Each structure stands twice: as C-alpha cells, then as structure tokens.
Amino acid sequence: KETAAAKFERQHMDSSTSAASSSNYCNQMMKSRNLTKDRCKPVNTFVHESLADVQAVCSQKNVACKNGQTNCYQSYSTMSITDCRETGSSKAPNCAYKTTQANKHIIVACEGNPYVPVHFDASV
C-alpha cells in the first residue's frame, strides 16, 4: 500500500500553490485528496511550502506530539498553511469545510530511513 511518507504528502502537502485562493479551497482539496470517502474527516491542514522545507523540519526542534510520542518536531519558521474544519450540516460524502489560511509553525511526527514526516500533529 501507500507508505506513511506518501500518505502524509497526499493528506497534507500542497506545495504547488502559495496559499488558498478562495473560501472553497478546503471543499475542493478534501475531496480531491480522498479525505471524505467514508467519513468527512473533521479537521485537516495543508502546508503550502516546498517538500524540501517541510522535510527539513525533522531535524528542527524536537518536541512531544499531543499523544505523548517523542518524535514530533516544530518548525522554526512559520509556514503558509490552510486549516480545513468540517462544519455541521454535511453527512459523507456530502461534506462541507471552513477554510482558514494562515501562517503558523507546524508540528509533525517523523520517522524512518530517510527520516521524514509521517504525521501532521498541529500548528502553533
């Protein structure tokens, strides 16, 4: 199947655009990245920075993930991101999302060889 590194890219990377370009960015992305199939994923964040920059975060500031895992890292620089929050109404596959473009530090879990992001934990 899909490697954890690849899943992270499909669920969280959007390097090809610098930021969201409308309030419908999240409705569009959650659907095309297949995050609404069986259930409207409640929250999801996309990072608008190069893959090289996001991967570099794994050798940046090591912090504990929200579940306590020791392999999370917080980015030193802020990054352009878009937060997607599922609303009320909607029932899969007819999901609806609130789009929020922002610039924040991201926290991701890393692992493997190469040691790369495998989980998006949060933004600060």
Side-chain angles (χ1 to χ4, degrees):
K1 54 150 69 295
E2 184 174 47
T3 65
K7 180 180 175 179
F8 173 88
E9 283 183 55
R10 169 176 68 74
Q11 296 186 152
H12 303 293
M13 296 292 311
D14 194 15
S15 300
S16 294
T17 67
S18 60
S21 62
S22 83
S23 60
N24 281 316
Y25 170 93
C26 287
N27 288 329
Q28 305 177 341
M29 299 293 289
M30 297 299 289
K31 179 187 254 290
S32 59
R33 294 302 185 79
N34 291 312
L35 313 178
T36 61
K37 250 284 289 147
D38 347 285
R39 172 252 216 306
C40 300
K41 191 182 187 289
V43 58
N44 190 69
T45 300
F46 291 99
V47 188
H48 301 277
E49 298 293 346
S50 75
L51 182 66
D53 282 2
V54 173
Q55 282 172 161
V57 171
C58 294
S59 68
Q60 285 171 38
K61 192 196 175 178
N62 172 228
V63 297
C65 310
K66 48 180 53 156
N67 65 6
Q69 280 185 223
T70 65
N71 62 309
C72 271
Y73 300 79
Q74 184 176 298
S75 64
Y76 278 121
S77 318
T78 51
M79 293 187 163
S80 168
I81 64 168
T82 306
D83 283 329
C84 296
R85 167 86 77 283
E86 218 273 328
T87 65
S89 303
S90 28
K91 346 244 69 168
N94 301 84
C95 309
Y97 291 87
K98 170 67 170 308
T99 298
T100 304
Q101 169 64 218
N103 291 282
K104 307 176 82 196
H105 294 282
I106 62 170
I107 301 187
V108 302
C110 301
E111 81 176 58
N113 189 29
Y115 195 70
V116 300
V118 296
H119 163 77
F120 190 89
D121 208 59
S123 51
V124 227

